[PDB]
Each structure stands twice: as structure tokens, then as C-alpha cells.
Amino acid sequence: PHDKSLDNSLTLLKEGYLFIKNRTERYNSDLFQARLLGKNFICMTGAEAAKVFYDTDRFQRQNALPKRVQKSLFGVNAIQGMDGSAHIHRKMLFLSLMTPPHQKRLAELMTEEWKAAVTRWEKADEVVLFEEAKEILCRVACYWAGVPLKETEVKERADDFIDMVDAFGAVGPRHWKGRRARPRAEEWIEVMIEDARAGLLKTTSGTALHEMAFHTQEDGSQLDSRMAAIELINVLRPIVAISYFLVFSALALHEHPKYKEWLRSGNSREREMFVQEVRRYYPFGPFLGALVKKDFVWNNCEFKKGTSVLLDLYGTNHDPRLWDHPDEFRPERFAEREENLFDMIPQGGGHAEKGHRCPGEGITIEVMKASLDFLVHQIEYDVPEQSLHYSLARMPSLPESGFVMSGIRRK
Numbered sequence: 001p002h003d004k005s006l007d008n009s010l011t012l013l014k015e016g017y018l019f020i021k022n023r024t025e026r027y028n029s030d031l032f033q034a035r036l037l038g039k040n041f042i043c044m045t046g047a048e049a050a051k052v053f054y055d056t057d058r059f060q061r062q063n064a065l066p067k068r069v070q071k072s073l074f075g076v077n078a079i080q081g082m083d084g085s086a087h088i089h090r091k092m093l094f095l096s097l098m099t100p101p102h103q104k105r106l107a108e109l110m111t112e113e114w115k116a117a118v119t120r121w122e123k124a125d126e127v128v129l130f131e132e133a134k135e136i137l138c139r140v141a142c143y144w145a146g147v148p149l150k151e152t153e154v155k156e157r158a159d160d161f162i163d164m165v166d167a168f169g170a171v172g173p174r175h176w177k178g179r180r181a182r183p184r185a186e187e188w189i190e191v192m193i194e195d196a197r198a199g200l201l202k203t204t205s206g207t208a209l210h211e212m213a214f215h216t217q218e219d220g221s222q223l224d225s226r227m228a229a230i231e232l233i234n235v236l237r238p239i240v241a242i243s244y245f246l247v248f249s250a251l252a253l254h255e256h257p258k259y260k261e262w263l264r265s266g267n268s269r270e271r272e273m274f275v276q277e278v279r280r281y282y283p284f285g286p287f288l289g290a291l292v293k294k295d296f297v298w299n300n301c302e303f304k305k306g307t308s309v310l311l312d313l314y315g316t317n318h319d320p321r322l323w324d325h326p327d328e329f330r331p332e333r334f335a336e337r338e339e340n341l342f343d344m345i346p347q348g349g350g351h352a353e354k355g356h357r358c359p360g361e362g363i364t365i366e367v368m369k370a371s372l373d374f375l376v377h378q379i380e381y382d383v384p385e386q387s388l389h390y391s392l393a394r395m396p397s398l399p400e401s402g403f404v405m406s407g408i409r410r411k
């Protein structure tokens with residue numbers, strides 16, 4: 001099929017997470033052609049389509065997206081835009097800092113932070129979850145990474161990380177906030193990398209700050225100071241971005257009350273299932289872009305070298321073919337469900353060691369479970385009159401108020 005509208009980029013901004021899905025459903029097809037982001041695109045959805053999108057013999061990520069994404073969200077010429085052995089090499093760096101051990105450690109640091117926070121929340125009237133999550137996440141991320149952070153900087157660093165995240169799919173003021181935060185963050189971290197390399201800053205083998213500063217490329221040389229900084233930021237920023245998910249989890253509890261008790265009469269088993277469903281059900285990652293690097297045919301389409309393609313993350317997560325009642329929050333659906341690498345792709349598909357799939361997925365899940373645990377067992381609270389509406393057009397999305405909690409008491 002071929003949408004020939006000449007304003008599809010504009011429509012993409014108005015429809016956001018539903019742009020691809022509205023059409024694939026309209027054309028009764030898992031693929032369609034369109035002119036987007038100033039390029040000739042093929043948009044696809046579904047697990048099968050995801051499997052092809054991740055075939056690295058047919059797709060490359062270099063030059064696949066407008067540079068505006070690199071100048072806000074990613075950092076210029078970083079891991080997201082690399083291909084081949086070089087990508088895999090650097091990808092191994094990231095992965096080595098996200099193994100189960102680091103995961104466990106980050107969950108641990110979060111559990112401690114939430115416990116301590118109870119003391120202050122009990123004394124406050126209201127608390128904005130998003131705001132509290134960003135700061136705790138930024139505190140933990142930096143400590144675990146060995147990145148010095150003075151209490152006076154916390155808010156400012158956390159705020160800068162979110163501005164980058166919030167600018168990825170925006171135009172205007174929202175996008176500019178990201179353009180201005182990235183250089184502040186980069187210089188801040190670049191100076192640390194350099195201090196570390198001169199031995200003027202204590203670093204610990206095994207920590208992100210350390211590994212990024214001393215990492216060696218396939219050619220034996222260290223990354224440039226700027227790049228090492230950009231890459232450490234691609235570790236820190238995303239951890240702080242977990243705040244969006246933490247908030248959707250609280251939203252889920254509030255909008256679907258039964259699960260609060262469901263969790264309570266439950267184990268970690270049920271927390272896992274709830275967290276899985278939060279990531280599948282709520283919008284965060286919209287779609288991924290790549291370029292056809294060698295002609296091929298799939299599902300009766302001809303992908304020609306040089307063509308841009310968008311893989312629909314959100315739509316796929318809501319595909320009835322693999323998810324019964326896909327538009328409803330039901331962590332029960334995960335009841336001993338077999339793990340699959342493409343039926344659900346909120347953080348990418350395939351294998352993280354064989355593609356660009358998110359290497360921080362385990363960390364995301366463990367931090368989400370630890371945080372969920374806190375909301376369900378460590379405190380009691382009310383959810384006052386507020387705007388909890390989240391947009392499917394706005395990218396990224398977040399319950400409007402940031403999720404205000406009041407009357408907080410230790411349980």
C-alpha cells in the first residue's frame with residue numbers, strides 16, 4: 001500500500017504512537033509506503049516484520065534517522081548509529097555493565113533510597129512521583145557508575161537528562177530544551193573522563209565511569225574524551241529515564257485497583273508479570289528506524305537498497321495476533337507465558353549481543369520491580385484530584401501531573 005499524503009511527517013506528530021498502527025489497520029496490511037522525515041519510507045509492524053527489521057544483513061542504522069535525534073537524545077555518532085563488528089565491539093562494553101550483578105546492585109541501591117525517602121514523604125503533604133523518581137534515579141545511576149554528584153547538582157543533572165529524553169520526538173521549545181541540555185551534560189562528563197585518565201579522579205575497575213574511560217576500540221585506541229562521555233551518558237540518561245515507567249506503574253495500580261491486592265497476595269512472580277505488562281502496555285519507545293542495505297523481498301514487498309523503514313514498536317506490543325485483548329492491562333496474560341524475543345519489543349527485539357536491542361532491559365525490569373515493591377508494600381497513599389491523562393500523540397508520553405501522591409504513611 002501507498003499513503004501518498006504530502007504531510008505525513010506532520011501527521012506522524014499528530015498521531016504519535018498510533019501513526020503506523022492506524023494505517024497498517026486501514027490498509028489491512030503489515031506494511032505501507034509513505035514519505036516521512038523527508039525520506040521514502042516503508043513502515044511495518046508485527047513480530048514477523050520485527051524479525052526482518054533485525055536481520056543485519058539487510059539493515060543498517062547509520063544515517064537511518066535525522067541528525068536531530070543525535071543532537072538531542074543519542075549524542076552525535078554514538079552506538080545507536082554504528083554497524084558491523086565495530087557496533088558489536090562497543091555493544092559488548094555496554095553489556096558488560098548491565099549483567100545480572102549490576103542489575104542486582106542497582107535494584108539494591110533503589111530499594112535503599114525508597115526506604116530512606118519514606119521518612120521525608122511522611123512529613124510532606126504531596127509528592128510528585130516523576131520528580132522524586134528522576135532525582136533518586138540520577139543519584140543511584142551516578143553512584144553505581146562512580147560518577148561524583150553533589151547534592152546541590154542532583155536536580156539540575158536529573159532535569160538535563162530528562163530534557164534530552166523529552167526532546168526526541170518534539171518540535172519547538174520541547175526539542176530545544178534537549179538541544180541545550182546535551183552540551184551541558186557532555187562537558188560535565190567529558191571533564192570527568194579526562195580527570196580519570198590523568199588519575200586525578202579515583203575510578204573503580206568494573207564501574208561505568210571506569211570502563212568507558214578506559215575502553216579500547218578494535219584498533220586498540222581509547223575512545224575520544226567526548227565519545228567516552230557521550231557513551232557514559234547513554235548509560236546514565238536511560239537509567240534516569242526509567243522514571244517514565246515508574247510512573248506508568250503507579251498509574252496502573254491506581255487505574256486498575258485489583259492488581260494492588262493481586263500483588264499483595266502475591267510473590268515476585270506477580271511483580272515480574274506486572275512489570276512486563278507495564279512495559280508492553282504503555283507507550284515509551286515509538287518506533288525504530290533503519291536503512292535497507294541490499295535489495296530483498298519480504299511479505300510481497302520489494303525493499304530496495306537505500307530505502308528507509310520504520311519498525312512499529314508500540315503497534316506490535318498491541319497486536320491482537322499475539323496478545324489477547326491487547327488494549328487492556330492484564331499482567332495475568334504473562335501467566336507462565338513462554339519468553340520470546342519479538343512478540344514484545346518495548347526495548348527492541350532480537351539479541352542484544354547480535355543487534356541494537358536495548359542492553360539495559362534487565363536493569364529496567366529490576367529497578368521497576370524494586371520500585372513496584374516499594375509502592376505496594378512499604379507505604380500507603382492517596383491519589384488526589386489531578387490530571388492523570390497521558391497522550392498517545394505526545395512522544396514521549398507521561399501521565400500529565402507527574403503522578404501526585406498525598407497522605408503518605410509508612411505501612
Ligand code: HEM
Nearest residue numbers: 079080235238239241242284285347348356357358359360
Ligand atoms: C527506561 C526504559 C527504557 C526504554 C523504553 C528503552 C528503549 C530502547 C530502545 C527501543 C532501544 C533501541 C533498540 C534498537 O535500536 O533495536 C534502546 C537502545 C539502548 N538502551 Fe534502552 N531503553 C530503556 C532503558 C535503558 C537503560 C536503563 C539503559 C542503561 C542501563 C539503557 C541503555 C540502552 C543502550 C546503550 C541502547 C543502545 C544499544 C545499541 O544501539 O546497540 N536503556 N533502548
Ligand SMILES: CCCCCC/C=C/CCCCCCCC(=O)O
Nearest residue numbers: 165168169237238241284285286287
Ligand atoms: C521525529 C521523531 C523521531 C523519533 C525517533 C524515535 C527514536 C526512538 C526512541 C527510543 C526511546 C527511548 C526511550 C528513552 C531511553 C533513552 O533515554 O535513551
